[PDB]
């Protein structure tokens, strides 16, 4: 394929997919991982607080 119109169409398709996927599960999974590591750090801090 050489035509620039089809090339730009496929490029825009890829941009739409990356934008919808980054707002569908990437942000929830990143927030879940951040919450998990925050939970680990507060568990350590709370064990220190228990002592």
């Amino acid at each position: 394929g050489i035509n620039p119109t089809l090339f730009i169409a496929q490029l825009i398709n890829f941009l739409l997919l990356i934008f919808i996927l980054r707002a569908l599960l990437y942000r929830p999974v990143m927030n879940l991982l951040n919450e998990r590591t925050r939970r680990i750090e507060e568990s350590v801090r709370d064990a220190e607080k228990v002592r």
Partner: protein, 257 residues
């Protein structure tokens, strides 16, 4: 199983014919007065549907303890996040969604190419009839436009992020040194210029070589002969996806530094 396999002579009973699959460009799927629908655009949309379906199935619950499909979805994301944390420190969050998408999409594209009916199922445009057969579900990475698009978005991403991180320094590099970066600098510039060509050509050639390998090994003996090559191909699809992701992230990391 025994090694006295007698079914290896199945080419007499089942002859697949010459390797007619030799097209290096796209073929139109359905006649539409607008822009043509390629054999790769339809499978790209199919992969979009599959990825969206698995994403919404694995994140409909957002369970604290991942199990089943959620753990499968989370494991690869954790592995990629740790990999990019190993490569770079503070630029993981800035580039993670783009690299993750450009990895998963090409992974499923290369994995779809090994699915049955890619080189067999097609639409007339059939040798018995007057219309020449064209294959259906041609892998998106085999198409040159998709590879050029991902290469050029990678180039735009790396250039924009390097410029943003380095101010005016990244725009003209360090050509004013005149002692060392006077002949190395132009070499680095032309390497950056030809980097998208290399990135697109690697995937395009790898997938094209894989599919023509499948066709030729079906041509030679279509029974128990192309099995190790099919295993190698399903391995190398994931390998090439990981290669593309790791190389674009490493190029970003070396450009910002």
């Amino acid at each position: 199983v025994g090694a006295l396999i007698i079914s290896i002579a199945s080419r007499f009973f089942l002859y697949t014919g010459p390797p007619h699959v030799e097209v290096a460009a796209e073929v139109i799927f359905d006649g539409i007065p607008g822009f043509p629908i390629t054999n790769s655009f339809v499978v790209a949309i199919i992969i979009d549907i599959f990825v969206i379906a698995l994403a919404v199935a694995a994140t409909r619950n957002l369970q604290m303890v991942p199990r089943g499909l959620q753990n499968v979805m989370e494991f690869i994301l954790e592995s990629l996040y740790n990999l990019f944390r190993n490569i770079n420190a503070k630029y993981v969050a800035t580039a993670f969604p783009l690299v993750a998408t450009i990895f998963l999409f090409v992974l499923f594209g290369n994995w779809f190419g090994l699915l049955p009916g890619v080189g067999s199922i097609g639409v007339c445009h059939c040798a018995a009839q007057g219309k020449k057969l064209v294959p259906l579900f041609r892998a998106p990475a085999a198409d040159l436009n998709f590879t050029f698009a991902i290469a050029v978005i990678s180039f735009v991403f790396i250039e924009y992020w390097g410029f943003r991180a380095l101010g005016p320094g990244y725009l003209k590099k360090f050509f004013n040194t005149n002692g060392i970066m006077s002949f190395v600098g132009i070499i680095e510039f032309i390497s950056e210029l030809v980097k998208p060509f290399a990135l697109a050509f690697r995937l395009f050639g790898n997938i094209f070589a894989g599919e023509v390998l499948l066709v030729v090994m079906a041509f030679l003996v279509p029974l128990l002969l192309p099995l190790p090559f099919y295993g190698f191909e399903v391995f190398v699809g994931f390998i090439q996806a990981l290669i593309f992701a790791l190389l674009t992230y490493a190029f970003l990391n070396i450009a910002v530094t």
